[PDB]
Design an enzyme around this catalytic site. Structure first.
Site, PDB file in Angstrom:
ATOM      1  N   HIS A 209      -9.544   9.805   5.529  1.00 16.82           N
ATOM      2  CA  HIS A 209      -8.361   9.518   6.275  1.00 16.82           C
ATOM      3  C   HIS A 209      -7.995  10.309   7.501  1.00 16.82           C
ATOM      4  O   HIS A 209      -7.840  10.007   8.668  1.00 16.82           O
ATOM      5  CB  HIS A 209      -6.938   8.957   5.580  1.00 16.82           C
TER       6      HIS A 209
ATOM      7  N   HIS B 183     -13.316   2.908   2.607  1.00 22.67           N
ATOM      8  CA  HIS B 183     -12.969   2.308   1.401  1.00 22.67           C
ATOM      9  C   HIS B 183     -14.319   1.747   0.556  1.00 22.67           C
ATOM     10  O   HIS B 183     -14.235   2.029  -0.523  1.00 22.67           O
ATOM     11  CB  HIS B 183     -11.971   1.421   1.290  1.00 22.67           C
TER      12      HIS B 183
ATOM     13  N   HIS C 157      -8.037  -0.017  -4.565  1.00 26.38           N
ATOM     14  CA  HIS C 157      -8.461   0.103  -3.498  1.00 26.38           C
ATOM     15  C   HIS C 157      -9.914  -0.916  -3.334  1.00 26.38           C
ATOM     16  O   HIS C 157     -10.152  -1.331  -2.269  1.00 26.38           O
ATOM     17  CB  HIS C 157      -9.207   1.494  -3.163  1.00 26.38           C
TER      18      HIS C 157
ATOM     19  N   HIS D 281       1.039   3.982  -3.165  1.00 28.89           N
ATOM     20  CA  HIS D 281       0.835   5.710  -3.431  1.00 28.89           C
ATOM     21  C   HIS D 281       2.008   5.992  -4.021  1.00 28.89           C
ATOM     22  O   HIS D 281       1.895   7.235  -4.447  1.00 28.89           O
ATOM     23  CB  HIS D 281       0.535   5.996  -1.839  1.00 28.89           C
TER      24      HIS D 281
ATOM     25  N   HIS E  98     -12.183  11.483  -0.095  1.00 27.33           N
ATOM     26  CA  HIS E  98     -11.254  10.222   0.228  1.00 27.33           C
ATOM     27  C   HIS E  98      -9.971  10.660   1.266  1.00 27.33           C
ATOM     28  O   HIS E  98     -10.114  10.047   2.537  1.00 27.33           O
ATOM     29  CB  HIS E  98     -10.561   9.588  -1.078  1.00 27.33           C
TER      30      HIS E  98
ATOM     31  N   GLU F 150     -10.568  10.968  -5.138  1.00 25.91           N
ATOM     32  CA  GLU F 150      -9.511  10.883  -4.209  1.00 25.91           C
ATOM     33  C   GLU F 150      -8.999  11.739  -3.250  1.00 25.91           C
ATOM     34  O   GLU F 150      -8.871  11.774  -1.827  1.00 25.91           O
ATOM     35  CB  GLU F 150      -7.964  10.708  -4.916  1.00 25.91           C
TER      36      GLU F 150
ATOM     37  N   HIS G 239       0.904  -1.114   0.040  1.00 25.54           N
ATOM     38  CA  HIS G 239      -0.096   0.002   0.138  1.00 25.54           C
ATOM     39  C   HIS G 239       1.161   1.155  -0.022  1.00 25.54           C
ATOM     40  O   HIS G 239       0.383   2.164  -0.749  1.00 25.54           O
ATOM     41  CB  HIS G 239      -0.926  -0.089   1.295  1.00 25.54           C
TER      42      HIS G 239
END
Lengths: 626, 626, 313
Positions: free
Chosen positions: A325, A361, A201, A174, A321, A306, A170
């Protein structure tokens, strides 16, 4: 030589925490450097937050702008004393990959660089303690497995969530597709990054769901309402850097506004997005409308959701998104009065461990799904490859059509990441899921006169529901996980195509260790993705159960001539892992939508009804060994 | 010799964390040891929880039971291997304090033994890092003060709450008066322990309130309702034993039941207690009623409230105070599912740092207050000492009637507590409040023909309220803090009594460091209280403000003949600190209720009206220096 | 209106009748209902900050100011000083005042009924700004003066972005500078933000000659006593910001009146006239500032002097 170059890079990566203490009389000399040092060293770096990405973009661009490799090393060296260890291991790492005369070139292990993120507080502790307890060259070994009361059933999933390989992947992904990526500056563009964002994802969620079912748990539900309180998770991770650790999240939290963003804004952003789908167009900054074309639509949506720099309207659409987080990460101290570090959600390396990750997600995946819903279904015409018939598929293992999964012990070397002192090596022992090797044999009849070229696509989906056995293809779409995609040529007449699991396009064949790298191998000469990215091999199939859970094995063959794109790119480079990673500096090698045939709605009640002649389903069992 | 004995004790205390690894083939041989060893080593030990206390008590008894000192060392050495370390320190300290054989002996510093509890996660980490970073004999010094954004005004209080001396004292006090204390087993009894429990905690709250007012903050409010959400606090302490740290408490959730105890359990207990006060009797196990006598009442209540082993009914009344600490401590993970360590509230060393501590303690103090309310007020007869008149009081300092307070830097040596490795010493620098030395001069006229003996009692109370200047004696009662209590003889005619602040009965004159103890001094040789207990000297007066906050200085003289008890006890032993600590193996030296004259309700609107001839109030200023 | 509605006004209405939204109980509304009373309720600020936020988002969309926009070349600000009893310190105290009720409520027999109240007030002060005019010719400048708090809620941090919300306008006026050094002195009394005087009924019955314009006359303008914040007994530190801009740019041309209600232009505007300043209201503060400290923001035609405001009990 390349080897020398590798050596220079590894030290950029060493003792990052320590590298602080600027030792710089003046930054003014470093005009290039002016744009950074803004986040203080000790602070945690957020992969999601916009500002942390603003400063990070500026680090990348200077290390791309550095003239030659030597210049690259120099600027990199200076600024990781002054511009902070935490962000600078980020601004260097991503740069370290992509700027041209770098090539040859692996990045030191993430797990190895920051062992503290991979292993628990206790096994960090014990090992550091052993080092001090008795000075001696002798090696220290610590078994991370622990002993504890297993209160939460979520714990069962830990093998998946906590897996070292998954977290590492992961992180790497990115890096290959940064949100900050500005195509103008680099000049090069990342093909279908928005769509890939969506696909990768989605797969993580899909794979996660297969674990729950293997577990006997129901599928994860989306974080559809923002009002609802979150489930708690305590990571037990320390940051070696300082005494601070990722803050744990108790039970029962309703969502709190942060200074940076309010929850209401998140809602408003999502409603816009869902509306722009319905409207079938999005509004650009210019206030022009761009259609959500069948070809383009997922990509455009991905950038907006995103969101990346690529978003057609950052200002109107926001960055749903990423903020999710951030908001979840600092639930414990939204206001920042109490001065506590963020949770695991803040970092790409850690985020998969928290169960909340999946909830969020899935929520975002839902957004993509609504878009997919707007598209029409696939006709026989689109699916079928005429003249080709799939006779049967068999999986060969110790027992045919059964795959066995077990737990394997492994060791991680801490020494590169944390101060070793006297000890030669400190290794922590951990356990992970693994499966026996297997092969597939597909019999295909090529009715045509001439040789054909086919892309073989293989997916796995759980046969059972939470109710009882029901192969409802609509639902299956969420669950299906991609095993492999490869090109094969078929002659006329009967053909048998054999492929081994090891070859899987989804997985990373091997990640070289620091030790491997110091040596100098030829696997080939690649990047941050090099050994890093790709899904981990042990992870290829779900755990299953001792009973031997039933899964549908789906194989489909499509016309390769249609599937491939023509163009002129490189030598054999990082393409092992094409399914989730893509190809280096290349266009995504498959024309079909990612996840095809599964991406669009399926009319049929049963999966079997869906099958065309160039498709086949074989039921196999996965049985775990205690 | 005693010195040798001291040496043996210090190593019982060293490397406690490490001491684990049992290295015992069988506990069966240690029949004595059979009872203990339930709590696992790494786990955090709770001073409050009943089960933990039970184990601790079992341990102490073995230590008490030890036939001789040598035997004492042996079992201790062996026990320390198996038992949880925290419990061990607790049990040993109690043993050292009481057991005669230990007529020799200080206990190693709590701050020094567990430096991690006293200093922050950052400066712990730093000194450890520096140790590893460059191996060298050279000393490491780290300044704990940090650099941070000051979001909460509660931060202002940190000098008080975070103070090393205060935390240490609290630890020691609980050791001198353990809740678990069983008088039958020991044979000896702790005089007025229940009342002392009440008094000490009340003083801590009172002193705390003076800090808030000095700060310009309002007085703390009790945890009157259990439903209300708590304010959050993040300790930033990482418990060196483990990689885990004390869990921080975020903002605001109503209280959660623990497996061990319910909230309507808690509430019920509170109503029982408040009822039995009203009824003026409590019910014993025998179902007999014991009256809440004026003499006995506070003590009986103290035992029940805490509650101690002494409680007349453990099952009916429960243990409200202790459970409060437990419940607050694991607010983050009541259910225990998430497997997180408790907060600071769990430990006597740490608990003072959390602001919640005051809220809870005021709540409990309220319980005592209701009881006090039931008692009748004091007549002139009780207060007055005839023939004696107090002419005036003056405080001498650099400027008369003004006390100056400043911040002083200090260093703490980590080496005894954490693995030093190569370094000779690792010291952490911290800052604490301190004040200039001062003296009091009291002029008293002795009208009588003969010499009299008087007990001089001195208290300090804030002049200002949160509204404006209002010396309402009823309110003042909560605020008044005890400066000093001492005996003086007055001849006929005018007399001037001078006392220095250093002499203060409330404070500990000095705590010997493990280094001083490494040699051998002659304060004398008594135990856990030795240098430890007593309130810290720097702390004697509130901070005040730069402006010079006004405080009432109250001096009262009482007839000593009445005040003292007769009996036959020891040589000059730990009596410096009598006001809060009591005297070693002796009855509390003052007949008057602790806190007299302040303990009972005051009828008068103004404090001045309250004064009798043997009382006096002098207004002085406390000014802080930035 | 049928789409965007009237958010601000409804906010006042909703808050005002929170007590009886239904109007069943037939209560009167709270202070929020009236322009005269509304400032007294603390809620007023909460709502207005909310609305201010809306404007701020819009401002956010605009790009920041370049040196080009800010700077006035050839002009340099050497220094600023505030003269009071003690230089660079302003003293604030409470003053008693009386209000005559008689015009408002039935007086009956009494000649006058006065109510005594107290309000904040400050000592008079002047500003002296030294400016160097590098150019050959005389220039015309608009002097803009603002005050902003030095201290945050945490510690001393002159973060210009935050400061934007806090900055209050002390004064705006036109001055001509000759070449060479110049010293411009202005008195607080002259402040463009404040109303010099409100005439009473008694004053009006008489007949004076400030001139004769109307509801704004003595009324509008911010009150004079109010010009600076209270500060504290300790003497709170505030940043004093002075900026000079090119007047030729700033003024608009047109043909309007005689000297009329223009004392109070900063907040009130001018009677039957266009707003006399081209710059956005609140300039330079209106747009986002990148700088770390306020100081970094300064151009040569800007200056910051730290002064203290100390209240007298």
């Amino acid at each position: 030589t390349v080897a020398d170059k590798q050596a220079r890079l590894m030290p950029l990566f060493k003792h990052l925490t320590a590298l602080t203490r600027e030792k710089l009389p003046l930054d003014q000399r470093d005009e290039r450097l002016k744009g950074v040092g803004i986040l203080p060293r000790g602070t945690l770096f957020s992969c999601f937050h916009a500002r942390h990405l603003a400063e990070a973009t500026e680090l990348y661009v200077a290390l791309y702008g550095a003239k030659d490799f030597n210049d690259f090393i120099h600027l990199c060296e200076q600024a990781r004393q002054i511009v902070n260890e935490g962000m600078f291991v980020y601004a260097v790492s991503v740069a370290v990959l992509h700027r041209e005369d770098c090539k040859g070139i692996t990045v030191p292990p993430i797990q190895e660089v920051f062992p503290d993120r991979f292993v628990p507080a206790e096994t960090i502790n014990r090992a550091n303690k052993e080092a001090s307890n008795h000075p001696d060259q002798q090696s220290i070994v610590v078994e991370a497995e622990e002993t504890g009361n297993i209160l939460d059933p979520e714990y069962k999933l830990s093998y998946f969530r906590e897996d070292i390989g998954i977290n590492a992947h992961h992180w790497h992904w990115h890096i290959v597709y940064p949100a900050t990526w500005n195509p103008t500056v680099m000049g090069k563009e990342k093909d279908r990054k928005g769509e890939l964002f969506f696909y990768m994802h989605q797969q993580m969620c899909a794979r996660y769901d297969s674990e729950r079912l293997s577990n006997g748990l129901q599928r994860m539900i989306p974080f559809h309402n923002f009002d609802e309180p979150l489930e708690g998770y305590a990571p037990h991770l320390t940051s070696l850097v300082s005494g601070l650790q990722y803050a744990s999240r108790p039970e029962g939290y309703s969502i709190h506004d942060l200074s940076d963003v309010d929850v209401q804004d998140m809602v408003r952003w999502r409603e816009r997005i869902l509306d722009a789908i319905n409207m079938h167009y999005i509004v650009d900054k210019d206030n022009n409308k761009i259609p959500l074309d069948i070809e383009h639509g997922t990509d455009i949506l991905g950038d907006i959701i995103e969101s990346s720099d690529e978003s057609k309207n950052v200002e109107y659409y926001g960055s749903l998104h990423n903020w999710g987080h951030v908001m979840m990460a600092n639930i414990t101290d939204p206001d920042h009065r109490f001065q506590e570090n963020p949770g695991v959600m803040s970092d790409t390396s850690t985020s998969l461990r928290d169960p909340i990750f999946y909830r969020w997600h899935r929520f975002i995946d839902n957004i993509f799904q609504e878009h997919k819903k707007s598209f029409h279904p696939y006709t026989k015409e689109e699916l079928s490859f005429p003249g080709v018939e799939v006779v049967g598929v068999s999986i060969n293992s110790k027992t045919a059509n059964v795959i066995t999964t077990l737990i394997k012990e492994s060791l991680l070397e801490l020494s590169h990441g944390i101060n070793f002192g006297t000890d030669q090596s400190v290794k922590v022992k951990y356990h992970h899921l693994d499966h026996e090797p297997f092969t597939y044999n597909i019999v295909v009849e090529n009715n045509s006169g001439a040789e054909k070229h086919s892309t073989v696509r293989i997916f796995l989906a759980p046969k059972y529901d939470e109710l009882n056995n029901k192969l409802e293809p609509d639902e299956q779409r969420r669950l299906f996980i991609e095993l492999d995609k490869f090109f094969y040529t078929l002659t006329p007449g009967k053909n048998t195509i054999v492929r081994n699991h090891q070859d899987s396009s989804v997985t990373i064949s091997k990640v070289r260790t620091f030790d491997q790298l110091g040596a100098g191998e030829g696997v080939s000469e690649d990047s941050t993705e090099y050994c890093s990215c790709g899904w981990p091999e042990h992870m290829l199939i779900p755990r299953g159960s001792h009973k031997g859970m039933e899964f549908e094995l789906f194989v489909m063959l499509t016309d390769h001539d249609e599937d491939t794109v023509a163009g002129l790119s490189e030598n054999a480079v990082c393409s092992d892992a094409v399914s989730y990673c893509g190809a280096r500096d290349d266009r995504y090698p498959d024309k079909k939508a990612m996840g095809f045939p599964f991406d669009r709605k399926i009319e049929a009640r049963t999966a079997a009804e869906f099958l065309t002649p160039n498709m086949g389903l074989t039921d196999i069992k996965i049985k775990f060994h205690g």
